[PDB]
Amino acid sequence: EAIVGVGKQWSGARALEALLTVAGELRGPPLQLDTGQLLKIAKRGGVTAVEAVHAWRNALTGAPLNLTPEQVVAIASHDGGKQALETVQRLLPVLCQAHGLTPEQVVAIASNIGGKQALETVQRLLPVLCQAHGLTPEQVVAIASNNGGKQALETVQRLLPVLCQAHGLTPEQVVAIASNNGGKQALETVQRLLPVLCQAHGLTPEQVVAIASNIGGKQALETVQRLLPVLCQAHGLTPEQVVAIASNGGGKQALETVQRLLPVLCQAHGLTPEQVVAIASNIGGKQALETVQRLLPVLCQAHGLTPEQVVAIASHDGGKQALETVQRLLPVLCQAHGLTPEQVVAIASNGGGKQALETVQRLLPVLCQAHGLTPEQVVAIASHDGGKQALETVQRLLPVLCQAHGLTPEQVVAIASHDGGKQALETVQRLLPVLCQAHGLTPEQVVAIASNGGGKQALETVQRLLPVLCQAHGLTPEQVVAIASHDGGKQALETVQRLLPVLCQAHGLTPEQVVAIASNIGGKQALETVQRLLPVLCQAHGLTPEQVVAIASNIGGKQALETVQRLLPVLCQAHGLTPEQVVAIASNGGGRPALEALHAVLTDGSAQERLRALQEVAGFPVIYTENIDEKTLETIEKLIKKEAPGKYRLVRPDGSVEEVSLEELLERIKENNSAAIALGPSGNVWLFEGIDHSLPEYDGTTTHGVLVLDDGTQIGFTSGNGDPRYTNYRNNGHVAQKSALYMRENNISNATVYHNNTNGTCGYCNTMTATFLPEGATLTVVPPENAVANNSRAIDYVKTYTG
Template identity: 55%
Template sequence: MSTEQVVAIASHNGGKQALEAVKAQLLDLRGAPYALSTAQVVAIASNGGGKQALEGIGEQLLKLRTAPYGLSTEQVVAIASHDGGKQALEAVGAQLVALRAAPYALSTEQVVAIASNKGGKQALEAVKAQLLELRGAPYALSTAQVVAIASHDGGKQALEAVGTQLVALRAAPYALSTEQVVAIASHDGGKQALEAVGAQLVALRAAPYALSTEQVVAIASSHGGKQALEAVRALFPDLRAAPYALSTAQLVSIASNPGGKQALEAVRALFRELRAAPYALSTEQVVAIASNHGGKQALEAVRALFRGLRAAPYGLSTAQVVTIASSNGGKQALEAVWALLPVLRATPYDLNTAQVVAIASHDGGKPALEAVWAKLPVLRGVPYALSTAQVVAIACISGQQALEAIEAHMPTLRQAPHSLSPERVAAIACIGGRSAVEAVRQGLPVKAIRRIRREKAPVAGPPPASLGPTPQELVAVLHFFRAHQQPRQAFVDALAAFQTTRPALLRLLSSVGVTEIEALGGTIPDATERWQRLLGRLGFRPATGAAAPSPDSLQGFAQSLERTLGSPGMAGQSACSPHRKRPAETAIAPRSIRRRPNNAGQPSEPWPDQLAWLQRRKRTARSHIRADSAASVPANLHLGTRAQFTPDRLRAEPGPIMQAHTSPASVSFGSHVAFEPGLPDPGTPTPADLASFEAEPFGVGPLDFHLDWLLQILEA
């Protein structure tokens, strides 16, 4: 065990007893029949009551892995790895079967999600007691909404608060929607956040604050939402006035993250210092750093490390330092760059500075850098045979867990019956991260899906291999977007770099789980989110929080496809399905957005509604690095084999492939994306947008060729 692991175990109530329990039980729990890893044992022990949780694992693991429970080892560990883990395990053993049956009808994954928090036992009991009532009038919550509320620390109290306050908050003068109330309640401290909204919403909508209801909800819908609302009310007048002169939108941006109160206080304390020499940051840069989970710590890290990182041997620009700091975990990412940049630029790694910055400039930047440091020499050797550029792209797009999954599963995927090339494995990791790699390894039923598609909706045309991009091209496109310093300029730049048309590039990005709005804004979601969307389009949607489908669930999915898609009328329904457009009701009034610095450190012009979208997704895509850092992206890359050259203009040709190229000189590089006539400004992807994106998974439409191409990439 490492020193850090020992300290983690000891740093909780009952730490002494937990250390003694680890010493006594670690060897047994690592052996048969438990087969836990050291990291799993440490995770269980590193909580209040760790000793009791380890005892609970010894007593319950074998039982919970067998019928009628059927939990995986990972699920049992997740339940046990919280304060009160032993009690949560016992509650799952007592209630899982009942909660899966009528009238509750929860999935195993939903029960695990509820139990895998501090107070999981009490949350399960609350769901059993209140689910039926909350699904009925006047609440009319869905099962998924009840589960979302309960699946956090303090889930029991949050459910009780929803039962008490939902009806009142939906009425005047609050006029919140059910979805807004659920969003506020679905976080640690949800009960307190609901109470704070009830107490402060009316005041915050009036002068001098003049916040919109949506802005108040955004602030409250994070861990520590109550404290963030109180901080906004206390600090708003000061931060709006000189010398800060922050806009209302900027204040909301800072407050709408976990730790928003602390971030606002840090801005007030550090703003003037960071605006002056030697930092000389712009207001927008300070706001960008503060507008993340851990914004306070990121600002403090910039103050501490800025001068060192700007000097030799690092030589980072101000924009690069800001880019690294402007993600969730920015402090840790800066510290990792400080520790690893000289090492990663030297032999045997030989990365350039831009590559290191690109990896560090996303949520989870520190573990991604550490994974590259630990695994790059291994992954370049036999049997992996990945290039440096491929490893960097995977780390930048999908992060640490994808690299770990490749190290664990690629030797098997390279052999029969999978026989995948390194390029295909890299593409799979970039499509869906660890979850996609594990799903392919476990047996995603691609053949069944493709056979049913052929039987129910035959379409004449060339095979998908001749239509879609190669795995290398797919990785290059995703890496280009994730390594671009100005996200909203990334789409236009990609048109020139890859010499393709807008419809073709949109289709390519859609085939890997990116909506049109996200593509045009350059905000590529993380691999986990995109993979969940793609599974939905393929007709399989595991519960939120499941890392990857289990072999049993995949087998059940294949059987359900046979039953569902084999029913009469499915072919006709699919064949006549029209191409779905974004519903008219998804148009949203523009709101203020968080501005992000451009290459010169100056604010870029905002996109309507972009702030709210980024806040709701918790900044899952933090892409700031310069496009020229993607040295592995070949110029004039032709995506697809049927190409037509159009030298004078971008031609929006229909069809399932990237059919046209354009000269880079013909592309406008102005400060705004040059939308074609009739295309509205992109707003935020709403639930209706995403539902439309995932609807009719087996229908015949413009995306069918690319869905076939995706299935071919995933088929092992």
């Protein structure tokens, strides 16, 4: 097949005849090219590249150019390869020695279609772009290293000051646009279409750039200009969904395909617009859109896959390739290799899914029979972006890591599983004998660093910074390893290296507090966010440095830090939550979703929803107004006066809240017998109208109960947030415990408490309830009497406890 691949090119017959003539010496010491490299040049570079590499072989290698055989093939195997090979020979000495470019950067420029043109254009414009527009050598090379690099370089030279000054486009965004093929066209299109897309279509400059920053930016932008109002008005898609499709490579093709297939996929195939857009918003969107359009029924009716599984497979780059591979290969992996269809889909639903699927098909027998891996381990490695690369690396490298360095197969698999597993595996092979000897790290510590996403980067960064962090700042090597042991370890390590002395000298944090923040997944993000927000939270909201660190030192620290700064005003001033309680929520992982969900339910919820949300999160007893006797009405007035609450709020059945006086509420609780009084020890009193006044069904989480007193007073309790003074009690936070403690504080000698819990009352209530009760008091605990138990030593019957 490779011979045909050459024969069908513009110089196919000539390249094959020339290659056979010169292969005798291309395989020699000067280059030592193998069969793939020899045909690769003939296929892509053609006859001129084949003759050029041979004829100039004595200058390309063994000369001050130091252009290795692999770099020669990379340059030769392009249209115009002969031209790039001569040009890199002429300019490489100058670009490196005079302009300071790394030989790898010059080769990266040479290894493109039109490499000669990019090489000469960089030689001319590099000092101009750097000195006139502030573009670093890395940015100019990034522009140059493309097909048509010359055109991207010249266009940036002309258009950067126009886009920056006329439209406010950041110079880095101009480079980002010119960082792919067609950079000239994307820049010109942005200049032409920004007035239209931002004014007529209502798109932001960031959205226009995001589209332009991909390959085919001109085509995606022009297509959005035409199709966005059609997709929005005819099919009910939001501008964000149209841009999201356009913001992937090949956006034009996905946009037109959605317009054509969306009404068919929804009406005939039963897919939602969100599923179609999700498929469309990728590279090769149109391919997989049409692929499901035709394979969806087949995979469902013949292969037994659900629409959700097929859409999931289609939602990754190259979705068509994973879809077609599953079509033909699923019955082989599940029958010849015995894999569960869910495992094959799990592999298929990845970037490069076709490659992981085909690799398992051919490689699973080797990893299991030769290297001793289980099918679950091989699938686990396969089900990741780049799974093919990790699988091949394990096959060849595992016995070297195990036999030469003493690692277990499980440690190799653990490294292999993560995205970039190939890179972490090779990096451990190189650095493991250095890290464990030059710095004295334990091999388990190096593996712990390696077994993370981006492990290669953390391994190299520890090798560089470990002897500096432990000396310039005095950190313990264990602290550096701990920082390195999370995804993105390089980023946390570099941030600590530069930022620790600032957080200590300016913000007053200890090195241990800086490490505690750094040792997370979002380490760099939490570290930099604390630097900016700590004095703002402390001065604006009265937080201590310890509270800011407590929020930062978790997963999602940046998100919790900003959310607390954002939501504290409304959470405390409007909803009556204590700032410490908002911090307590933020101190947990996922702090922001928790506070946003609390905000949403407290803002748009009904009186019943706000009562449950506030009581479960804040903690307070609730007194129901159904009993309107003078004795209980006076109890409420007396309890309030003793506390002097700062705010009083009335909550209407529809969820709206008004600021009220105490006198108004005291009248309402007497007249309104469909209401509940919430007495927050923080100094916040609510009156809720229009609630259920009952116990919701037990849903397997925080539950409810009611305490009924002799005089008819009914006190509602929730489980969960208990009394800090009794933390050491294993019944703390239970309805029976809150009832017994309520009776103690209120000198109640008799009460009965009812709760809904279909799993039974836990055994801890059987002795601790009497302890919490004051001497002489009796509490009757009544189960729902609709279930027995879900554990041992549970109470399914009414029991009385006396203090």
